[PDB]
Symmetry: C5
């Protein structure tokens, strides 16, 4: 095996698409190994630009191709460079722009915490012929920044592991484990936009539907509330435009369902007050005092989940 | 004919688009055959990376190109590798990322069960010159997982068949049958999102329109119901954003049409109660008792289909 | 001139986009001609795969490039093959996936009948140097199937014609006519989706607005109708999401305009009934009997067009 | 300088996107010049197909590359051909499919008149080394046709000019002027779709809001009008889906603002009638006679602009 | 080090997408350096077109590749040219079309002022082997123009700096600083479209909700206002279609929240007037005089921010 030392410099992270849980990473990858000594023009290292490395690979140079495991599509490699030293070490530098994908858990949607994962692996050479010594990730450009709505908290975590592939076991008897490099970058979602953009209008709608119980007109108790019901019902697919069609429920959908329950319970409660109007003149005060208990009890509904969920 | 043994390793399945019934498959394909013995450096097998296989094909090596039949666009082949053995066998390993298409039947839309199909076939060599011995599909990464909203149930089914092509009969007299490999992966749709996102709000709207019959105001019987009618009418094209413009009707559209029938029948029933108001003071109770029968009978409508359909 | 015999096998037709009147065709194209006899390894025909045909073209082989005239973008050629025979005939087989475009007439939109047209033509060689003997279209995979919402009725029609190009007349004096091959595949749109998805809800809305004339409350005559007016007005741009911004009107837009006329005429009729209320107590029955004539006469409006249009 | 004679044949014009003011042009470009006499096989001209011209350029042939100035992205050149004559003249024929961009003035949006502009220019050779003798544009396929919603009126105008580039002045002292070819194709927008799709529904809404002044119920004067106000307000961003976010106002937006002014003036007028109800029983007729003047005066508003604008 | 003189000519700037803060730049880049003297055909400089420069790079010519740092994806280089002089200087001219990205601050959204930034840098050669002498930016085509909705004010600013890269420090001991060129083009957003398209309709809605306090009907005080509330609530996500999901609030969102506060305060104020109706006949005038103070005080709310923000 030959040891390869990697250095990944993340230029920027952009285009975090939560619909299909893919993000876009731009950066540079440096892979340095050692070989037989060679002669170079002068004592300076020889620099081979793009569309000239293939001329050296044709002549017999050994340049492994390191692929990205969790990519979507293909990584768009731009300029690439090969630095050959007189002492006999080779440096393969390249620029990559890849749409990577990682599994995300959007339970706590407004207050989420995810991680962007970069997986690097040789395509053909296993650990018997290629090993990863170490990786230093230089996340200086996005160390503590906000990209679109995600804060990058802390540094990046690096891991070197061995992955056993069983589909190559029929062609390689006992050498089918490949060295894999994992780079994890923690990100925390910014809840401010949803706080002033959906939390406040939904809370205002819910408070307006709370304040409909004080009216002395029955038709205006029912029509305005119903309206508010129908608007909150129309607010159902807000999360499905941002995220995907998730099986679980998020905080925003939980408060939407809570608004459904509260407003429909108010509708059924005033209809049950009309049920209790046997003579049509009877007025309720103990069950219509919900004017005071309705808002508080609903408030409790959300906080309970809030605590249980975080 | 020369026998080719295939091994397809599905890295991940993502991007299941039901509008045009295409999904995206990432993975590795290994095709192993045997030939004349050759000399290699040392006793180890010789590994030929990408943009170096063509140099061997130019010199006279026999590397068939296996295409994907049911692809949309072209498969995006990334890194590719050729392993030549001293005993005289050749292994062609490649990474494919293809947008494949399969026919889907969205009758039971929330509780669907489809299959993802991968079809592999030589482009030029028929079964007289190329045969598929066996395929082992290594679906270990997606064995029992949820990808976006589809559960992968069970293992993958493999089939090797012969497809007779009639367009090559005018150029090949009696050898126009090609060996085809089919990989079927069963998937079951997760009904949870539609259960809490569309089933519950539509049921709440329908129950609210059921509870409008108890009012003692005629204008408020009609205006609120009509509203609920117009919202359920506005809920018509929900399925056409997820799936295509299907000729048949799904469960969601069936309950939407059932809501149309129930709510419009309530509208026509209260209008017919006003028809029976010859003196304008007559009140109905046998036909206005639908307050009790209306909800139940409607409930029956859906269950009947539910049973007949599953 | 040298005669070229073509065989086009349509693998599948998908992605029929009516916004820009383009569809996507996948298939195989076989072009067979004859030349000088040559020597091949053994007596079997020699098969030349992709990225190896150019080596033969460099050495002096004559392989014409047949382009697609009505394509949008460029056809995505995948694998390609060249079969050379010892008797001296050449077969050029290729796989094409092209976004083709044809003019469509969406007058009868729900009950349309279009045709998918494939035009094939040599790029450089005219009929003095290249002629098309015959084309057999093998439409076996889509013979009688439904693709997305189009039924393929009957077989495919083939035509071989000569197209005179005037832009090459300044460089070629009397030889500027190119042989063109046209393949026409008839398709009929399935009206079922629009029948249960837009025909029925619009008919229900129109019937509900018909049934508003029986009310004994004037404000509830006007507000509900107006609403129904405003919803039918909001249903104007349904056709523009499916098709383009057509200059003519389709069946769906014709019934939308008919709903405009009927509902606005009902609005103006009840307002004119209020006009006739000089003392405010006068009630009309001859012009308010429209309760019976209104629905029928409107029904007549559509059928008349229906017959005139089909 | 060497004179180059151009012939541009427009196959079709499609995909006119007014959001970013780009259209798509498919066609053929022929560039003919003369050089030293050469020997060809026989007396017929020699035809060099695609991926074979570069072999002649390597050997020393002079083939200039003519770029398109106003393109978006890069032009997708398909098949290309080089015709070499025994008398010593070279013809470069190519097929281009380019997304071109031109500045458009959407003041009169429904009744617009734009022009599609194709700009062709040598990339490197100035007028001291390359001149354009003449261009004949063969717009026979789209001479008098409708493409999507644009009529092509008249023929195409051709112009040959010299463009002085100042960024090449630091590297070329007195030779930095390049020969440019401009092709202008006049197009007139079809106003029919907007006439039956937005002009008529907006006019119907405005007429319905005109006819609300005849009611003898004050609450029904206000609620229905307000509704109509809110719908016309919701019709604000119709132009921004077709065109971009223009700084000026179009005819459709001008009539939308006119509907705002008319309907809000009716709202403020009936509220001012309630202002004049000091005793609550006073009824106005001179200022409430707007029933007659309101519709006419509004009609005048639009026509005035109509005339001033065209 | 060898000095390289750059000249960037911006052909056009288009496609300013504020959702992901990327724009598209088309233009030409000229890089001129000097080397050893060489012999050319005649005394004229030798011009090497595209797909011929690589033949010179193979033979030993030194052509550095200058990349764009802030690009998204990869720059689409079209035609490229190499001008070699007899005195021994090399000019590399190229055409670039790149999707560049810059950080934007959408606080003052309708009255914004941003800058488009182009960053150019050698891929491999540091300042010890490649230096940038000067750059002249020829922004003559977009000097004082409006592109889509942005005015280009003033000229372009050029800067040459040194960027220290730490990821190359492990492979280069003390030479890891690269010469970088920054081009800044100031742009000012045109507020006219938002002035006539969203400022005026929102102001009209707010004024209509101001004018609801003058009614002598309580149900019509509440229902119309509520409606206006619900429409202004529905106007929440207007900014999120133009820009992204920003954490801060813009002017349009600030006035939307101000409309929320004003209209909901009017709703709570008329409900509190009903609270003060202990006998149900009491009418307020000091707190219901808001008819005069309500509009003015709200007006003040916006202006205060306006001044504090600009």
């Amino acid at each position: 095996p030959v040891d390869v030392s990697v250095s990944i410099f993340i230029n920027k992270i952009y285009g975090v698409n939560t619909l299909e849980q893919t993000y876009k990473v731009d950066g540079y990858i440096v892979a340095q190994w050692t070989g037989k000594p060679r002669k170079t023009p002068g004592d300076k290292p020889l620099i081979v630009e793009n569309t000239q490395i293939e001329r050296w690979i044709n002549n017999g140079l050994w340049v492994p191709a390191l692929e990205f495991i969790n990519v979507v599509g293909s990584p768009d490699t731009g300029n690439k460079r090969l630095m050959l030293f007189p002492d006999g070490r080779v440096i393969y530098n390249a620029r990559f722009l890849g749409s990577f994908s990682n599994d995300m858990d959007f339970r706590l949607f407004p207050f989420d915490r995810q991680q962007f994962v970069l997986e690097l692996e040789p395509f053909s050479y296993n650990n018997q012929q290629l090993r990863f010594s170490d990786i230093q990730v230089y996340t200086e450009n996005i160390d503590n920044e906000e990209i679109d709505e995600w804060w990058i908290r802390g540094k990046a975590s690096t891991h070197i592991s061995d992955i056993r592939y069983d589909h190559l076991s029929s062609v390689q008897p006992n050498q089918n484990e490949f060295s894999r490099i994992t780079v994890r970058i923690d990100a925390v979602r910014n809840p401010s936009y949803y706080l002033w953009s959906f939390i406040l209008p939904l809370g205002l709608i819910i408070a307006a539907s709370w304040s409909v119980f004080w009216l002395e007109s029955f038709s205006e108790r029912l029509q305005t509330s119903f309206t508010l019901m129908l608007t909150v019902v129309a607010y159902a697919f807000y999360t499905s435009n941002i995220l995907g069609r998730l099986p679980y429920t998020t905080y925003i959908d939980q408060m939407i369902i809570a608004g459904y329950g509260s407003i429909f319970a108010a509708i059924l409660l005033i209809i049950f007050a009309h049920h209790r109007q046997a003579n049509g003149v009877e007025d309720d005060l103990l069950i219509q005092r919900s004017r005071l208990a309705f808002p508080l009890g609903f408030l409790a509904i959300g906080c309970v989940l809030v605590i249980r969920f975080f």
